[PDB]
Design a protein around this ligand. Structure first.
Ligand code: 542
Ligand code: CL
Ligand code: CL
Ligand code: CL
Ligand code: MG
Length: 213
């Protein structure tokens, strides 16, 4: 019995089916009062919400679902017909994420793919009929942010204007990615200072808007 399964059970015992805000609240409660977990959390989540509402993306890719917190967060703000694709390599976590989304009533807006981003990204055009992505949320292994950004470009999945939004650019940090996007003429970057989930420790999100090749 794992921490992730305990979070899911707590949501099943304390939230309301079909109510995404009650799911977010239950997770945040559990992780504040019982056991910390690496969800984006409410402080950074509010910044994500503001960014999503600003750009109104039709197709979002999430790298690293974990328990599904950010997938609930983002999916609840998508317009009718807009979609989220989320990649999660750990089969147990993929199942928790799907169950979380089902409980929240958001399943029609999301596709949870159980595999590693480096294997799945090259399949998005052929298998999933994706043209380009409007937004990418990076929240998987930190040493994979830069490799996967470069892969997304190689596969033709970024357009002029695609919004990348990266968690944890301060803690744990993603130093190669952050240096790269800030130094590159192909990205216009904005830093949003915030706090590590459930902690009084500075963290931040980076927005990096692709400018084309
Ligand atoms: C590499 N390709 C991949 N493709 C698909 N899924 C992938 C994946 N890599 C990892 N994953 C999945 O993403 C998730 C991993 C995320 C890694 N996150 C962190 O390490 C992390 C770590 C902290 C953290 C902060 C402070 C601290 F003291 C300790 C930890 C905070 C966060 O917000 C984090 O996001 C898991 O669900 C994992 O199975
Ligand atoms: Cl749109
Ligand atoms: Cl730049
Ligand atoms: Cl928080
Ligand atoms: Mg994170």
């Amino acid at each position: 019995d794992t921490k992730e399964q305990r979070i899911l059970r707590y949501v099943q015992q304390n939230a309301k089916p079909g109510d995404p805000q009650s799911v977010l609240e239950a997770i945040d409660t559990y992780c504040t009062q019982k056991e910390w977990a690496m969800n984006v959390g409410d402080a950074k989540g509010q910044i994500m919400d503001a960014v999503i509402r600003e750009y109104s993306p039709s197709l979002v890719l999430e790298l690293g679902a974990y328990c599904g917190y950010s997938a609930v967060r983002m999916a609840r703000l998508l317009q009718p017909g807009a979609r989220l694709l989320t990649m999660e390599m750990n089969p147990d976590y993929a199942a928790i994420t799907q169950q979380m989304l089902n409980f929240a009533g958001l399943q029609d807006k999301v596709t949870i793919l159980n595999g590693a981003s480096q294997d799945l990204i090259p399949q998005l055009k052929k298998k999933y009929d994706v043209d380009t992505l409007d937004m990418v949320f990076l929240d998987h292994w930190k040493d994979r942010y830069l490799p996967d950004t470069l892969l997304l470009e190689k596969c033709g999945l970024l357009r002029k204007g695609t919004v990348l939004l990266a968690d944890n650019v301060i803690v744990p940090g993603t130093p190669d990615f952050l240096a790269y996007v800030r130094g590159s003429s192909s990205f216009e970057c904005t830093h949003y200072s915030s706090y590590l989930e459930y902690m009084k420790v500075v963290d931040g999100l980076e927005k990096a808007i692709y400018q084309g090749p």
